[PDB]
RNA sequence: GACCUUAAAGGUCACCA
RNA sequence: GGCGGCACAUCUGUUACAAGAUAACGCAGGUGUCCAAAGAUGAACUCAAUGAGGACAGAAACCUCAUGUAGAAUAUAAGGGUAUAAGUUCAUUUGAUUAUUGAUUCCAGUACAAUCAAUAACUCUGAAAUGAUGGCCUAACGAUCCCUAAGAUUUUUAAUUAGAAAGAAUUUAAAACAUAUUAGAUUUAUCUGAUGUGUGAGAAUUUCUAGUUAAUCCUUUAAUAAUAAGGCUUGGGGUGUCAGAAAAGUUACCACAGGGAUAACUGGCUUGUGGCAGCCAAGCGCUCAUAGCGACGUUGCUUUUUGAUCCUUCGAUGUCGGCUCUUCCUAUCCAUUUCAAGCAGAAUUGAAAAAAGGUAUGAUUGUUCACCAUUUAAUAGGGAACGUGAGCUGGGU
RNA sequence: GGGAACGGGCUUGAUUGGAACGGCGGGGAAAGAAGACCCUGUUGAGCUUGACUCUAAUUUAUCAUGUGAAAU
RNA sequence: AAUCCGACUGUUUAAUAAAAACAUAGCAUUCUGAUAAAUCUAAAAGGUUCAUUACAGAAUGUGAUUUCUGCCCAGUGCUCUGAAUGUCAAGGUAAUGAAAUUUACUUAAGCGCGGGUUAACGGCGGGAGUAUAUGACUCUCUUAAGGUAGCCAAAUGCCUC
RNA sequence: AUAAACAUACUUUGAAUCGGCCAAGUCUGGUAAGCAGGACUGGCGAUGCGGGAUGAACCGAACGUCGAGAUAAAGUGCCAAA
RNA sequence: GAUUCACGCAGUGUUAACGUGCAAAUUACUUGUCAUAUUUGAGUAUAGGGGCGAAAGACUCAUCGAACUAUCUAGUAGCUGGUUCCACCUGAAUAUUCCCUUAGGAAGGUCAAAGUAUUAAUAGUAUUGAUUGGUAAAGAUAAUGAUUAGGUGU
RNA sequence: UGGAAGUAUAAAUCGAAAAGGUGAUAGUAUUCAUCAAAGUCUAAAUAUUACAGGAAAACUGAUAGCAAAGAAGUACUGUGAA
RNA sequence: UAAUGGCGAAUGAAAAAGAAAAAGACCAAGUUGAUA
C-alpha cells in the first residue's frame, strides 16, 4: 500500500500553518512582582481581527 | 485389543520359560539435554523465524501398540509390537 | 493502496470502523477506542 | 447435469471465452 | 482449464487375446480394520434344506427318524480352499518368543513390505507320528535426520595368597621440593635465603595351574571417580501427494519465457441432433389400404442447427449484425408447359419438365431469429473463410 | 485432385504476345507487433486476508541503589 | 410533453471514458484538557496541525431542502467506571544433590468469565387448514431479529418480449 | 533334422531416446469420426527407386559408379515403351 | 459562488480532416466555458514502499499498479532461436522402476567405440517324447444364472 | 565461527582474588602438565591490475588490440546523475 | 581431512613436520629519598 493522508500530515510540507498575517501570540504578560503583589493598569488601545 | 497380563514366555537372560508381566509402552518425557534438542534450541535462537519444518498433514488415526513384556524374576524386558488397533485394553 | 477503506465492486468499508488505540499509524482510520457508536439518545 | 440433505422434495454450483 | 472425481498407496472378478507382461476419467465392487481368541494343538461331531412323526404348539419355539457333495459356515469385497475338516462343541495352552543363515514375489534383480526353507535354544498340545516363528489364501500400509524405549553381565583383566617353569635387566654433566637444621624479619590463612638426606637414580620380569578380592558393552582425546552426554543393535512416534516440502486468495491495471503438446472462429472426418426423402401397409378418408395421409417397423441423403475430436494456425488468418454488390444450388414461392383429385364453375391440393427472369415497404429489438400492419403475380429456402471491416458502421459482444 | 484435411510452384486438364498508363479493393490465409484471450512454467509483480514465518509502532512485568520514616 | 441519475456553482483518467464518478454545503459518529490526540524521524534540549486550546485539534460515513430513519448485541469488532484466584513469560523464593541439573510455590498484561454498543462490520424465516376465487381468521415448525414505513419487471425481475 | 569360426562369450567407457504415427481375415468405449485406448507383427519416422495420374505409411523392392541381358508390382487405342 | 456576449481557455460531437501527419495527440466547424472553489508569471517547499492526488492508480521531464541512472550482472531459465570442412564404416528410441513427476531427470533397454577369451561359450526353426493352460468353439433339468411353450401325475 | 551443553565480539544485569588461566562434552573433587591475561614498541622474510620509469612476449594487427594508433573520455545527447 | 549443515544443497580449519627470515626491548607497580 501507500502512505495515507494522515501519515503525510505529520511531516508538515504543504500542511504547515498558513500563519503569515497573524497578529502574534495571544497570552497574559509575564508574571512579576507587580502582578504577584500589586496591580498593573493597562489601556486597551484597539481591538483587532486576528486571521 | 484385549490382552491379559501375566504371560508365560521365553526369557533370553534366564534361557528358560518364566512368567512375564505385560504392560503398555508410553513414550518417555522428552529431555532438554539430548544433542538433538540442544541443536534445535541453538538454531531457533535469533532472527529467522521457524528454521525447521513443522509437520501439519497427519493422516493416520491409530498407532501400533507396543507391549513391554517384563521378566518377573530377572527384570528382563522385551518389546513386542502389535498391529494397529483403534481400541486397546489390558484385560485380566 | 491509498486507504484501508479503499473498497471493491461496491463502495463500502468491509470491516468494523471501530479500532483499538494501539493500532499503528497507517491502519488507525475511523473511530478510535470507541466506547459506543450510533445515534445518541 | 454435478454435490448435499430430507421422507419424490428441496438447497448450492452450471465459470473464462 | 475450472467445478466434479481419484483411475495418486492399494485387493478381487472382467475387458484380456488358454505362458509372462498388459490401456482408457472401461465395467461390478473393496482397504486404512477386526481378533486372549476369531492364534496353537488334541478329541468328538456334521452342515443348509426336505419329508414323516410328537400336549398346549399354529407357517415359525423344543424332541426323534430318514434323505442330505456342502446347495451351510469359515470377521470382511470378490474369487479360490475346506466334510472322521480349514465348519460346530469341548479341553489344555501362549510359538502372536530369542538368536543365525539361504532363497522367492514387486524388482533397477535397490529399499520397505510380503512369501518360504533350514539351524541353535526354551516351550505348548498330543499316547504318538507330527503340528506350532499369528489369523485358510490373495489388500489391511511407511525412508534420511530428530525424539523415545529395550539389550549388550555366558566373558576378559588387574591385585594378593599356594605350587611349578623359563628370566641381565645398558653404562657417567640433574632439577621438583616431602621435608629436618640454621641465618634473618613478622604477626598474619605469616613469610623469606642457605646449609642437609633420601626421593630417583639405572653399570627384577613375565607365564602357568588352584584360590580369594575387585572390576567388566565402547567414548568424552593428561589420569580416575557418581551425574550427564554421545556411540552399537532392535522396536515405536510419519509423512494418505502413501520412495516421504512445512504453505491461502485475487488481478477486468497486470507482466515475461513459451504452446497450435491446449480451449474460444473458419476449414477437414462423423451426423447423434437439426433438415429433407424414400420401402411395407394397421388403419383414417360416409363404402374405399395407397384422391390425400399413412401407425408398428425399416432404408437413406445433406451440411443450411448444435454437438463430438483437436489435424492446420498462439514471432496474430481482424471475432456478430446491418448497409452495398456479384455469382452459384434446387429440396420452386410467382410466371410458362403438362398429369392427377373425393377437379361441375371459381378457389384449391398432390406431382413432372424447368433455375433464363422476379421475389417488396414499415412499427419494436444491436440482434440472426420472432411478432404485428400493409402491398404484391410472389413477397421461397440456402452456399460462397457461418461471402463481403487497407468496402462502410461500431448498435452488441 | 492429393497434401499438414483452403496451392503461385506438385499431378491432370483449361489456356497464355513482349512492355505497361489511369483506376480498383477479390486475392497475395498483404503490412504493422516473439497473441493482450486460453493453457503450460515448480517465472513474476500490484492488492487482500487469523495463508505460513517474521517486523516497526502500541502495550505489560522485572533490572538498572536519592533521603527519612511507618504497615504488612 | 415526460421518465432516470446527480441537489446546485465546481473537479476529473496530459494521449480512446467528462460522466450517474470526485468535491460540496447540510446531517451524524469517535477520541483528546494540551506533559494530550493524530503523526514524521535511526536518534535527538528533534518536527507538523499548534502564532493553536473543546464555537478547538485529529479520524470517519452520508451527500442540498422536505418527510423519515424500523427490528436485531447471537457471530466478529470496539469498550467497561468491572470480577477474581480458570489459564498465562522472563524473573523471585525454597528443597534434594558433590554440583550442573531437577522439582515445588508465587508473579503482569492478554485471553476466558459478566455488561454496554449497530448514523460499528453486518442480518432481518418456513408449512398447512379456512368466508364461484382470494384468505381477514386459525394451527404448527424456530430464529439474535424474522425485511418495518415505503418503492418496483426500476441503471436493481431469471422466468420475461 | 537344419543352420552356425569375420561362430561364440563377452568386459569397460559412453552418445542419442523414451511427444510418436499407419496398416490389419484384431479388441474395448462411443451413433460415429482422418475419434480415444490396447494384444501380435510389418512399416513410416530415419527411405530414396519402379507402379497406383497426384499421396509418410498401399504393391514390388531397399541404393558405391557404370554396360549388357533376363525380370517384379503392373500394363499393351493416343498422351505412353509394349 | 445569478443569466449571457467578447479577449482567452477547454475538448461535447462530426466517432469530420490527418493518420510513413503541420503535430510521437495537431487542424476545421459545432459545443461548453470565459473573476472569487477565477486565470496566470517568478520565487519557494514536498522525492521513490517516497511525494502529491476535489480520487482517474491519476501525476512525479514523451518513462509510473512503484521514475531515471549506475553497480551486484555475462542475474537464473526444465523454455524459443542459432551452432561453421570432405570421404568412409557401424547405426537407434517411445518398454520397465522412482521423482512436487506429466514440455524435465536418474536406474534400465536399444546403439557406437575401445579391449579381450580357444570357447561346460549357438539358435525368434522344424521333428519325436512327456507336459502346462481354459481362449475360439460347445452346453443349456451337466452345476450357477436368463428365457418360450407342450405333454403326464397329485 | 569448522569449534559441536558456546570459538570470538558487543550490549543489559551481575562482578573476583592471601592470585590465577588453559588441557574444546556440561558438572564436583583429587592429582598431573603448561603458561602467568586484562599497558606499549619492534627490523627481515610477505602483498600490489593506483601511479611513474624500464625490459620482455608461440598476445592483437585498424569491425582486431584499451572506449581512444589523428585536437579520445574528443564530437554528440540529456535539467541532471550520467 | 576433524568438524559444521532442513546432517540436504553445501561450508570447513589447526598442532605436529619441511623451508624463507630471524631480534629483542620498554612503561605501570615495587625501591632511593637534605628527594628534582
TrEMBL record, chain B:
Its Gene Ontology biological processes? cytoplasmic translation
Which UniProt keywords are present, listed alphabetically?
Answer: Ribonucleoprotein, Ribosomal protein
In terms of superkingdom, the source organism counts as Eukaryota
Q: Secretion signal: which residues?
A: none
Q: Which InterPro entries match?
A: Ribosomal_eL44, Ribosomal_LSU_eL42, Ribosomal_zn-bd
Instruction: Please name the PROSITE patterns in this protein's record.
Output: RIBOSOMAL_L44E
GO CC annotation: what is one? cytosolic large ribosomal subunit
What the entry lists under SUPFAM superfamilies is as follows: Zn-binding ribosomal proteins (SSF57829)
Name the segments for region: Disordered.
21-50
Gene Ontology MF annotations = structural constituent of ribosome
The family annotation for this protein states: Belongs to the eukaryotic ribosomal protein eL42 family.
Record's protein name: 60S ribosomal protein L44, putative
From which source organism is this entry?
A: Entamoeba histolytica (strain ATCC 30459 / HM-1:IMSS / ABRM)
Amino acid at each position: 500500500g501507500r502512505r495515507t493522508l494522515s501519515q503525510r500530515k505529520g511531516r508538515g510540507s504543504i500542511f504547515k500553518s498558513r500563519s503569515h498575517h497573524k497578529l502574534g501570540v495571544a497570552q497574559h504578560r509575564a508574571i512579576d512582582f507587580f502582578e504577584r503583589h500589586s496591580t498593573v493598569r493597562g489601556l486597551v488601545k484597539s481591538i483587532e481581527h486576528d486571521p | 485389543v484385549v490382552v491379559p497380563k501375566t504371560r508365560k514366555t521365553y526369557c533370553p537372560r534366564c534361557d528358560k520359560h518364566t512368567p512375564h508381566k505385560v504392560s503398555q509402552y508410553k513414550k518417555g518425557k522428552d529431555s532438554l539435554h539430548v544433542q538433538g534438542k540442544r541443536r534445535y534450541d541453538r538454531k531457533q535462537q535469533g532472527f529467522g523465524g521457524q528454521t525447521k519444518p513443522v509437520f501439519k498433514k497427519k493422516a493416520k488415526t491409530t498407532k501400533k501398540v507396543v507391549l513391554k513384556i517384563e521378566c518377573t524374576k530377572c527384570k528382563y524386558k522385551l518389546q513386542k509390537c502389535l498391529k494397529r488397533c483403534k481400541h486397546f485394553e489390558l484385560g485380566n | 493502496v491509498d486507504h484501508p477503506h479503499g473498497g471493491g465492486n461496491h463502495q463500502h468499508v468491509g470491516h468494523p470502523t471501530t479500532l483499538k488505540r494501539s493500532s499503528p499509524p497507517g491502519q488507525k482510520a475511523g473511530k478510535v477506542a470507541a466506547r459506543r457508536t450510533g445515534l445518541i439518545r
